[PDB]
Design a protein around this ligand. Structure first.
Ligand SMILES: Nc1nc2c(ncn2[C@@H]2O[C@H](COP(=O)(O)OP(=O)(O)OP(=O)(O)O)[C@@H](O)[C@H]2O)c(=O)[nH]1
Ligand SMILES: Nc1nc2c(ncn2[C@@H]2O[C@H](COP(=O)(O)OP(=O)(O)O)[C@@H](O)[C@H]2O)c(=O)[nH]1
Ligand SMILES: Nc1nc2c(ncn2[C@@H]2O[C@H](COP(=O)(O)OP(=O)(O)O)[C@@H](O)[C@H]2O)c(=O)[nH]1
Ligand SMILES: [Mg+2]
Lengths: 145, 73, 30, 39, 430, 19, 37, 439, 430
């Protein structure tokens, strides 16, 4: 029953989409106030960062607030808009190691690729979310506490 | 295992020696204590990085309690 | 693990003020 | 995720400080005794 | 000792070099903060090649960032590895070039070359024995194609003996994002042939070709294309930073790669490129590395060397493997494809071995080659330069800067002279 | 489910004989 | 508890009305028991 | 940092400015009062609002725009509008009397009373900025104020800032529908200044937008505000690269160079896509290959000419949203393999690709749907020259019998300038014909 | 050493080959992951015959899957053993032939064969000493019967000396699921007779008759028919992979069993076929095996051997038995059925013994024979083919692909010449 006379009418097909999150959340941005001490690392002082979590996609952007007579170059942002890793700085993956759609092979035009059902090589990645980040917790921002 | 520098390296050495790191830490301006100083310094740094990392792993998630449709409402 | 529960819609004889005639709730001391 | 034998150099994988069955070596020790102390 | 000055010009150069410094920081175990988290001493033995030393055990990159537009500098500084760079190494102007070669080379370039020369001279004297300079830029832009060639000119007068290698980006005709692209390229390749020890021709279209068919990436951004470039740049100096079974450096290949000083254009390749689905199926072995090396698919410029003759071949292997399994396959690939090699030079292949493989991988190999096919790239710019110069189109932008007309004639003359003698070496009897 | 009010039971909703 | 929304772009098209529709009377006995198999 | 100043002129400039500045305030998230929302914090980046706004010590942002008109009523509604406290009272400039559809009145009699006013307030705004990218000017060739009072302004702006770019967004007379009869007289005379005192023109006519809105957006009874919102979409797409980051950030100088081969040819044709209502938008999938095809039909041009009758010569793109660079390249390769789309002989590569990240915003109560990706096209081609020929045909039939000339002569116009400008437009038409010839 | 590459054309070949790769894997103990979880040492000694080594102890089949439609590839990949196959070996087009031999062999097959021949060449050069290839296809398909003949027509030219085997599926007249079925078959059998070392004629209808009676399954799906086929390939190469007391291989059987090169069509057979109820009521012995395949009911072809003369007989055995018993049962069957054996060839039987039986079973045998009965299967097609070709029915689909009319006549002429010469060998006096 399980091997010789078993049938499967449908073929699996996974699909992704982002416009649901895009048109649902969109402009909703969560803002949090941060502090990173640097007094341990020789010529370092307390820095007041500002965290932004984008509910539309899940990325994080960090700004900074400088004092009056600050000697910094008045930078726009500490970090750009990207998915912040949660386990520290991940090692550099191989070229093309991280993909979205697993593919069997080329249709051998220029737009043809067959998605294999069995996902084989997955680069598991852990990123901070609004679920993870709260008030009072500590965050490893690319190696910074 | 991985490469560790055995302590008595000969003086005629053409290699990177963290002179400023040893001079800011302690001791004197010699590479034989200098390289050991840098070694346990980076070991200590790895230790507290691992401590931070396991604390982040220790922090637990919480309950989504309610439906995202009601959240949007 | 596994949870289970039941309910029963009891009915007072007269239309009484259903705010003073409430059944008490007993909890386990443990 | 990453290995540690990636960090291997030809020099110290090739030159290292220098460090048959026990029944056989015991048999040969008995053979040596039965000649050196043989009368 | 053996230090490298990394120059970085233009938006393309800034993004590529940022990807490059991310790659080798992982290779040398450097966090975004600036400290060293590597486990073995071999990661920190020749970190003085690329990294300058600062107090508190902080390693700062030895790079100079330049661009006429301040916008790209903000994007680089806000990177993951954004704060590792030094703000004094950031040199930038207030007005861009607008893809105009003449503006970045003559008018606006003159105000910023002095400050750039101050930084690179300081960084030159900081190191005690410099091997040479390394510049990444784009040939179709306004700053890298423009001021970047100007910085090439001034440095050679200042430091003649020092080598330069340039990983320039050569524009493609099939896909083009600039209309005055033929003008800037034709006025830059003239500066390259006069002052360049070695050129690496990188084309964006060939990278898109690799990602679609070799690597099967559905939506790779420019970071993945910059990833392939950054891997190529690390694969050149891998023998320099780490010990090797058969050591070499930039000059070992450069002496062996330049039979005549006019020919210094090399097309690079990278060996271990496969889709993430089939990694378990592929067996990491020396024969499969060489077959992925010598196919026309893997190579990241816009020329097919089946139409040309291989002049000289350089192959740098990463990791420990067999020189016998190396030297045999270079001999087999020499004997089988005899027609694709020149006859007046037996043994066209140079091999180098570094015992350390790259991070996250067990073997890797970088191919550098000089062949007759690169002349196809230049002449296809002649078809687009001459046809649009014939109508004097897009000229008043360049003419308004004060330049003459004879510069266009002599730049085409030198480039036509370059390809003609390049054609001559193809049809050469041994 | 167990109809008896065993030690397994946790709530117990009943009236007081006062009520 | 709000009603099941449609496609959110269609909700934006429809406007505020398709947002508007969504949002001791009788005694009862109750129980719960939490057991591990 | 990059900064831009708007010099919107006349009723057409003021009405467009209301829609465009409403879009910018929503784009960065500015309240109508001016202050940033202390409660909500959509987005980030102080530099992001520095291209348009100039924040003061109190925290309020002040727009960098000058509203000038010779009739007070068009600006008075802005003075009592929703954004009254947003705009500077000094930035809003009015006049007692208008040109009354006379190019000569706004150029020699009524304009000169007020030139010293606007020039210094422009200078004050320029003194606020450190690095000015250029100037955007919005006006119309029909009304006298938008034509006459403009024509002197960038003539004096050219001698004040020789190197600063001056972009031109203008309203051309439509081929059939006209809101005035003396309009070609102002149209012909204004065309001199857009030749030797302009860098690029953004020619658009109201009738062509009317066709687009009724066919795609299903608005059968359109108004001027619907036209002004699409124009606001055009300019925001142009300056999108300056405001926010992207893979290929393109400045105004970058696309000026890759659009203008000769100093006399600076009249590209714009295109915007997608322009679809909400009900249709989610029903049809949108892709990079699809939106770039929507940029190429003659029915989607906001000018009344067929590019198939002309020849594409310099063509600029501005992608925006979740765009992926192959789909750009695969789209371009698909475009090139079409005999219907033809290019000049001397421009084998005439594409200028620009990629940005932030998808276009939608103003609520508007007409365009919220779309993930968009595309802007600035295709300079020689088919536009036919539109000037029709204007010359309309001008010639009127010029012959000396109609309406006593108005212009009485203001202080010498009649020979009417003939001289006609020969200029003849010369410009032949210049377009020269490029159309293939060697 | 001695490697076999498995070609897979058409839906019929795809499903049969999937079960074939399923069956030989449990014999070699390879899990659906691709690791070796077997117990015995000789189970992993000669896996290089069919399998290629991959990193991490992974074995991949030496199989090339080609089909004009991508739908079957999804199903075969969805098959439990589809994870083992290498992804790049999946070569497939967009439009099928629609059971048109015209389209597959000429029109759409030409666009795919190039992508096929690169892969099979890569498999060919991967191994050192290739023994031969292996192809499974149906003679009435559009892909297998069409471009399948195109591939073997090519593969003779570049690789002439290698052994060419195909487990073709032959149509039955009694059960037909295609109306243009003889049109594909007649244009295909001409391709086999010119270029094939040995062909095994498998009939679906004969599979049903075995399933009806010998094992009496009341619902024989295509899996059971393929599994009965899947036993057969395991029986012809079991002496190759595993040692035996009397060794053999493909060349050893092929030389002794082809007397004249034009005759290469053979009736295969399998010994241990019994119903589950009668497994008890059996006495596993050499004579009991010997009685089974020599009954014409056991044959999985659609022709009765009692109507012709047995030219050559080959029986390869699996398991440990006596030389005396197998040799004597060889001898008795030759003596008793004297009329069914030819006279000009003494000792018409050849025997091989492999010591290793299948797992879980004590004994097995495979019978392969060349008999005069096969020309009945050929002439019966001509009775059909002449009927449609007389009225020129179903012709414009073939004529619409650009070929002539004469290719039908010569294909019948070659078929006519084959059976006429085949009939002559039956009526031959010693
Ligand atoms: N598309 C569009 N065109 C407009 C708009 N407002 C005015 N126009 C055009 O402007 C032309 C007349 O000029 P106006 O802008 O009304 O007035 P003006 O520019 O101040 O010049 P004067 O009339 O002399 O005062 C008309 O023909 C319209 O086509 C608008 O909001 N949108
Ligand atoms: N491969 C690659 N090319 C890039 C990248 N960024 C920009 N480019 C190329 O750079 C060219 C534009 O250069 P441009 O910005 O004008 O150079 P600049 O004027 O010196 O700043 C385009 O043709 C792009 O193909 C990148 O990250 N990777
Ligand atoms: N024995 C057997 N025959 C099969 C199987 N699958 C298909 N067939 C036969 O294959 C024939 C159809 O082949 P077709 O799909 O047209 O081959 P293609 O055109 O080359 O893909 C039918 O007559 C079936 O009898 C199978 O699993 N086993
Ligand atoms: Mg007006």
């Amino acid at each position: 029953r399980e091997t010789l006379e078993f049938v499967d009418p449908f073929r699996p097909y996974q699909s992704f989409d982002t416009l649901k999150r895009f048109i649902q959340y969109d402009g909703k941005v969560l803002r949090f106030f941060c502090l990173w001490d640097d007094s341990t690392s020789l010529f370092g002082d307390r820095r007041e960062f500002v965290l932004h979590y984008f509910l539309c996609d899940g990325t994080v952007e960090i700004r900074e607030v400088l004092p009056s007579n600050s000697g910094r170059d008045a930078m726009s942002s500490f970090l750009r808009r990207g998915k912040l890793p949660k386990y520290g700085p991940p090692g550099i993956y191989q070229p093309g190691q991280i993909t979205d759609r697993a593919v069997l092979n080329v249709y051998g035009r220029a737009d043809g690729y067959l998605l294999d059902k069995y996902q084989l090589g997955k680069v598991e990645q852990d990123f901070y979310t609004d679920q993870d980040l709260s008030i009072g917790a500590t965050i490893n921002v690319w190696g910074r506490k | 295992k991985t490469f560790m520098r055995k302590l008595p390296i000969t003086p005629g050495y053409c290699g990177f020696i963290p002179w400023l790191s040893c001079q800011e830490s302690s001791s004197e301006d010699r590479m034989n204590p200098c390289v050991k100083a840098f070694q346990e310094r980076t070991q200590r740094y790895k230790e507290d990085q691992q401590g931070l990392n396991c604390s982040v792993a220790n922090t637990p998630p919480l309950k989504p309690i309610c439906s995202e449709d009601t959240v949007l409402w | 693990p596994v949870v289970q529960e039941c309910y029963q819609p009891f009915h007072l004889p007269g239309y009484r003020y259903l705010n003073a005639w409430r059944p008490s709730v007993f909890h386990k001391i443990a | 995720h990453v290995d540690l034998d990636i960090y291997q150099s030809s020099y110290m994988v090739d030159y290292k400080p220098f460090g048959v069955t026990p029944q056989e070596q015991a048999k040969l020790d008995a053979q040596l005794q039965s000649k050196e102390f043989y009368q | 000792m053996r230090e490298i000055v990394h120059l970085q010009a233009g938006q393309c150069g800034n993004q590529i070099g940022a990807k490059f410094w991310e790659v080798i920081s992982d290779e040398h175990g450097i966090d975004p903060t600036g400290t060293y988290h590597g486990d073995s001493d071999l990661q920190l033995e020749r970190i003085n090649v690329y990294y300058n030393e600062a107090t508190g055990g902080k390693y700062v990159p030895r790079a100079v960032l330049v661009d006429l537009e301040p916008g790209t500098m903000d994007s680089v500084r806000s990177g993951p590895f954004g704060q590792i760079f030094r703000p004094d190494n950031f040199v930038f102007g207030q007005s861009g070039a607008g893809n105009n070669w003449a503006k970045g080379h003559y008018t606006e370039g003159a105000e910023l070359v002095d400050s750039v020369l101050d930084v690179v001279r300081k960084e030159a004297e900081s190191c005690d024995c410099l091997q040479g300079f390394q510049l990444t830029h784009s040939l179709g832009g306004g700053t890298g194609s423009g001021m970047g060639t100007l910085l090439i000119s001034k440095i050679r007068e200042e430091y003649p003996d020092r080598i330069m290698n340039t990983f320039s980006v050569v524009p493609s005709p099939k896909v083009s994002d600039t209309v005055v692209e033929p003008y800037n390229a034709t006025l830059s390749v003239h500066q390259l042939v006069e002052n360049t020890d070695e050129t690496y021709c990188i084309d964006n279209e060939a990278l898109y070709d690799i990602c679609f068919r070799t690597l099967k990436l559905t939506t790779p951004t420019y970071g993945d294309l910059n990833h392939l470039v950054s891997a190529t740049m690390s694969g050149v100096t891998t023998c320099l930073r780490f010990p090797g079974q058969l050591n070499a450096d930039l000059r070992k290949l450069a002496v062996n790669m330049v039979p005549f000083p006019r020919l210094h254009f090399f097309m690079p390749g990278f060996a271990p490129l496969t889709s993430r689905g089939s990694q378990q199926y592929r067996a990491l072995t020396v024969p499969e590395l060489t077959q992925q090396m010598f196919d026309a698919k893997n190579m990241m410029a816009a020329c097919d060397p089946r139409h040309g003759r291989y002049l000289t071949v350089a192959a740098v292997f990463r990791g420990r493997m067999s020189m016998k399994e190396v030297d045999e396959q270079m001999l087999n690939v020499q004997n089988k494809n005899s027609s694709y090699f020149v006859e007046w030079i037996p043994n066209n292949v140079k091999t180098a071995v570094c015992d350390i493989p790259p991070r996250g991988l067990k073997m890797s190999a970088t191919f550098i080659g000089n062949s007759t096919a690169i002349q196809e790239l230049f002449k296809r710019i002649s078809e687009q330069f001459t046809a649009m110069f014939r109508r004097k189109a897009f000229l008043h932008w360049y003419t308004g800067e004060g330049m003459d007309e004879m510069e266009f004639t002599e730049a085409e003359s030198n480039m036509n002279d370059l390809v003609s003698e390049y054609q001559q070496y193809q049809d050469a009897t041994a | 489910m167990l109809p008896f009010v065993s030690n397994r039971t946790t709530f117990f909703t009943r009236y007081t004989p006062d009520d | 508890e709000a009603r099941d929304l449609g496609h959110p772009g269609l909700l934006l098209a429809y406007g505020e009305e398709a947002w508007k529709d969504a949002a001791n009377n009788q005694l009862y006995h109750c129980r719960r028991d939490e057991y591990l198999p | 940092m990059r900064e831009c100043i708007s010099i919107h002129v006349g009723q057409a400039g003021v009405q467009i400015g209301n829609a465009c500045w409403e879009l910018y305030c929503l784009e960065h998230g500015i309240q109508p009062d001016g202050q940033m929302p202390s409660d909500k914090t959509i987005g980030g980046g102080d530099d992001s609002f520095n291209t348009f706004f100039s924040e003061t010590g109190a925290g309020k942002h002040v727009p960098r725009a000058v509203f000038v008109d010779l009739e007070p009523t068009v600006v008075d509604e802005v003075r009592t509008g929703t954004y009254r406290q947003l705009f500077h009272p000094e930035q809003l400039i009015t006049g007692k009397e208008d040109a009354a559809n006379n190019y000569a009145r706004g150029h020699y009699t009524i304009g000169k009373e007020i030139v010293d006013l606007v020039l210094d307030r422009i200078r004050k705004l320029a003194d606020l900025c450190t690095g000015l990218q250029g100037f955007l000017i919005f006006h119309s060739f029909g009304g006298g104020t938008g034509s006459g009072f403009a024509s002197l302004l960038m003539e004096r702006l050219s001698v004040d800032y020789g190197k600063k770019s001056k972009l031109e967004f203008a309203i051309y007379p439509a081929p059939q529908v006209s809101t005035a009869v003396v309009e070609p007289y102002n149209s012909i005379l204004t065309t001199h200044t857009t030749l030797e005192h302009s860098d690029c023109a953004f020619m658009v006519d109201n009738e062509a937008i009317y066709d687009i809105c009724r066919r795609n957006l299903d608005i059968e009874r359109p108004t001027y505000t619907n036209l002004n919102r699409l124009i606001g979409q055009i300019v925001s797409s142009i300056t999108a690269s300056l405001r926010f980051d992207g893979a290929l950030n393109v400045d105004l100088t970058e696309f000026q160079t890759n659009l203008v081969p000769y100093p006399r040819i600076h009249f590209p044709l714009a295109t915007y896509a997608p322009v679809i209502s909400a009900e249709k938008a989610y029903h049809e999938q949108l892709s990079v290959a699809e939106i770039t095809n929507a940029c190429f039909e003659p029915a989607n041009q906001m000018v009344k000419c067929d590019p198939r009758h002309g020849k594409y010569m310099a063509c600029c793109m501005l992608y925006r949203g979740d765009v992926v660079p192959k789909d750009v390249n695969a789209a371009i390769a698909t475009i090139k393999t079409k005999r219907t789309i033809q290019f000049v002989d001397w421009c084998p590569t005439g594409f200028k690709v620009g990629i940005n990240y932030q998808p276009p915003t939608v103003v609520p109560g508007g007409d365009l749907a919220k779309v993930q990706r968009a595309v802007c096209m600035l295709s300079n081609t020689t088919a536009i020259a036919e539109a000037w020929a029709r204007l010359d045909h309309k001008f010639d039939l009127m010029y012959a019998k000396r109609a309406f000339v006593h108005w212009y002569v009485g203001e202080g116009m010498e009649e020979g300038e009417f003939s001289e400008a006609r020969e200029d437009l003849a010369a410009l038409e032949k210049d377009y014909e020269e490029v159309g010839v293939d060697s």
